[PDB]
Amino acid sequence: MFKNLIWLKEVDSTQERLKEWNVSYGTALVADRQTKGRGGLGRKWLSQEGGLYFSFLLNPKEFENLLQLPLVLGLSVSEALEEITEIPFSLKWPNDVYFQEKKVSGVLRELSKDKLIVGIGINVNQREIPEEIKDRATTLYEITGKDWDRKEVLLKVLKRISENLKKFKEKSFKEFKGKIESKMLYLGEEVKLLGEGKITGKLVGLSEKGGALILTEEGIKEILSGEFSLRRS
Ligand SMILES: O=C(O)CCCC[C@@H]1SC[C@@H]2NC(=O)N[C@@H]21
Secondary structure (H helix, E strand, C coil), rough: CCEEEEEEEEECCCHHHHHHEEEECCEEEEECCCCCCCCCCCCCCHHHEEEEEEEEECCCCCCCCCCHHHHHHHHHHHHHHHHHCCCCCCCECCCEEEEECCEEEEEEEEEEEEEEEEEEEEECCCCCHHHHCCCCCCCHHHHHHHCCHHHHHHHHHHHHHHHHHHHHHHHCCCCCCHHHHEEEECCCCCEEECCCEEEEEEEECCCCCEEEEEEEEEEEECCCCCCEEEEEE
């Protein structure tokens, strides 16, 4: 039941606040502005007006795999945006939501004590996109040519997250493998993964474990580490 909100006008980071405050699971902390945002395309643009920045607590004892989780959340984020805008979106392993070549959303997940802090940033109404990420990022406004009710968006997103997380629990990742893999970005293309190494080859798909399958010279390798980031090559 992700439907009750805590909407602030400015914080250092919704991630940090939930790391500090003791909130109940299933409640989303939203912030119009973030002075010390962290993750994805940087801190500078996470302080822009028009973006949708929020975080929420999940039970660590209940969502053990922090590789499939980001994918399911990303799948939930894209599904909500597609339902709203009726625009096709792609998923970039292992977390980002993309429209074509540029990112629209990113899923962050941290752990602290007995907390699983999930932070999600969505590009909705930012009008003045930074020149340094004009190439890698886009907004709902830029794509569709109109603004969107950030509250309406957040609600349908929280709903999909809720609905999908219930299935991911009751059932398994098998329920989303096909949905996710079929929306994967750079699929069939030459790509390069970096993090705890650097593997380069053709992204051939997604394993039932949520791992990225790369076709190298000596076989297809399955990448499970969340450390890795997937970029073109
Ligand atoms: O870009 C990413 O992939 C990571 C998530 C983007 C940042 C979100 S926005 C709200 C929350 N608070 C943060 O400091 N980070 C996350």
